[PDB]
Automatic annotation (TrEMBL):
Function as written in the Swiss-Prot or TrEMBL entry: Endolysin with lysozyme activity that degrades host peptidoglycans and participates with the holin and spanin proteins in the sequential events which lead to the programmed host cell lysis releasing the mature viral particles. Once the holin has permeabilized the host cell membrane, the endolysin can reach the periplasm and break down the peptidoglycan layer.
GO biological process: cell wall macromolecule catabolic process; defense response to bacterium; peptidoglycan catabolic process; viral release from host cell by cytolysis
Residues annotated as catalytic: 140 (proton donor/acceptor), 149 (proton donor/acceptor)
Cell compartments where the protein resides: Host cytoplasm
A UniProt-annotated Pfam family: Phage_lysozyme
CC per GO annotation: host cell cytoplasm
Gene symbol of the encoding locus: e
Protein name, per record: Endolysin
The entry's keywords: Antimicrobial, Bacteriolytic enzyme, Cytolysis, Glycosidase, Host cell lysis by virus, Host cytoplasm, Hydrolase, Viral release from host cell
UniProt key word Lipid biosynthesis: no
Taxonomic path: Viruses, Duplodnaviria, Heunggongvirae, Uroviricota, Caudoviricetes
HAMAP family: ENDOLYSIN_T4 (MF_04110)
UniProt family annotation: Belongs to the glycosyl hydrolase 24 family.
Length: 290
C-alpha cells in the first residue's frame, strides 16, 4: 500500500527532502493514524536532531490528536515515552517545559494513562531546577564568560571551576569538553544551567554520603533542601555538618527555633545577606527571599 510505501521510502539522508516527503505522507493519506503517526514521530525526531524545536513542537501537537482515537493507547504511549526519554538529555529548558506542559494537558483525562504522572513529576523537577539555579545566581552570581576566581583559577557559570592550570587554552578545552562545542570561552544561560545542574547532582550525592546531613536532607521538602544545598555550596559538606543543633531542629521541623539558632552562627555574622535569605527559606519553605 502506498501510505506504507511513502513512509518507508521516505527515510533518507537529505533531511529537508525526507521531511518534505513525510509531509507528503500526511498529505497523501494521513487520516488512518498508524502511518501518519509514524511519519510525525519521524519528523519530530528529525527536527530534534536539526535543532528546530518550534517545528518539532508543532508536529508534536499533530501527533497528540492521533492518540485520542487514531492509534492504540499502548502504542501512542510507547512513542511519547520514547520522545520523553530521548529529550531528557537536552539542555533546552524552555523546549522541555513546553513539551511537558502540552503532554500534561493532552493526557489529563486519558483513561488508564500512566505517562501523565511521569511527565508531571519531570515538570515539577524542572521548576525546582529553575528555582535553585536562580537562588544560587542571586547568592553567587552568573557569568557567561570565563573568569578567574579569588584563587586565580579559571571558572565560568555559577562558580563552575574549569581548571587550576594557568593556561587559558586548557580552560577553554575543558569547557568545550563539558559543553560539547567550540564555545571560545562563552556560553549561554542554558549551558551555565547544565553545568550548574551537574554541580547540584554532585552536591546532592555528597550530602547523601554525609551521615549527619542525610537524615535532615531526607526529612526536608524540596525548597528547604535547596537551602541546605545552598549552604553546602557556600561551605562544603563538613562545614555544614557543624550546625549540629540547627540541623537537628531542622530535622524536627522547628523552623523558627532553627532560624534563630542559625542566625547566631559565624556564617550569619560573616555573610549576613545571603545567610538571611537562606534562613528565610529554611523558615518559610518558600522562595520569597529570592
Ligand atoms: O525499525 P526501523 O525501520 O529501523 O526504524 C526505527 C522504527 O521506526 P519505523 O518502524 O517507522 O521504521 C521505530 O519506530 P516504531 O516501529 O516503533 O514505530 C523507532 O522507534 P521510536 O518509537 O523510538 O520512534 C526507531 O527509533 P529508535 O531506533 O531510535 O528507537 C527507528 O529507528 P530510526 O528512526 O533511526 O530509523
Amino acid at each position: 500500500e502506498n501510505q506504507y510505501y511513502n513512509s518507508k521510502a521516505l527515510k533518507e539522508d537529505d533531511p529537508k527532502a525526507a521531511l518534505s516527503s513525510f509531509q507528503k505522507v500526511l498529505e497523501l493519506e494521513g487520516e488512518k493514524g498508524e502511518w501518519g503517526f509514524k511519519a510525525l514521530k519521524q519528523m519530530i525526531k528529525i527536527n530534534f536532531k536539526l535543532t528546530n524545536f518550534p517545528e518539532m513542537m508543532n508536529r508534536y501537537k499533530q501527533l497528540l490528536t492521533y492518540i485520542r482515537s487514531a492509534v492504540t493507547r499502548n502504542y501512542s504511549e510507547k512513542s511519547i515515552n520514547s520522545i520523553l526519554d530521548y529529550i531528557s538529555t537536552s539542555k533546552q529548558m524552555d523546549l522541555l517545559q513546553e513539551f511537558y506542559e502540552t503532554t500534561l494537558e493532552a493526557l489529563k483525562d486519558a483513561k488508564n494513562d500512566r505517562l501523565w504522572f511521569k511527565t508531571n513529576t519531570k515538570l515539577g523537577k524542572l521548576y525546582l531546577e529553575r528555582n535553585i539555579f536562580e537562588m544560587l545566581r542571586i547568592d553567587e552570581g552568573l557569568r557567561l564568560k570565563i573568569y578567574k576566581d579569588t584563587e586565580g583559577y579559571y571558572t565560568i557559570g555559577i562558580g563552575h571551576l574549569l581548571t587550576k592550570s594557568p593556561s587559558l587554552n586548557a580552560a577553554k578545552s575543558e569547557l568545550d569538553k563539558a559543553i560539547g562545542r567550540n564555545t571560545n570561552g562563552v556560553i549561554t544561560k542554558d549551558e551555565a544551567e547544565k553545568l550548574f545542574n551537574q554541580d547540584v547532582d554532585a552536591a546532592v550525592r555528597g550530602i547523601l554520603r554525609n551521615a549527619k546531613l542525610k537524615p535532615v536532607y531526607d526529612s526536608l521538602d524540596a525548597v528547604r533542601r535547596a537551602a541546605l544545598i545552598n549552604m553546602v555550596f557556600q561551605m562544603g559538606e563538613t562545614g555544614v555538618a557543624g550546625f549540629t543543633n540547627s540541623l537537628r531542629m531542622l530535622q524536627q521541623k522547628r523552623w523558627d527555633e532553627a532560624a534563630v539558632n542559625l542566625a547566631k552562627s559565624r556564617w550569619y555574622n560573616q555573610t549576613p545577606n545571603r545567610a538571611k535569605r537562606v534562613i528565610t527559606t529554611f523558615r518559610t519553605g518558600t522562595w520569597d527571599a529570592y
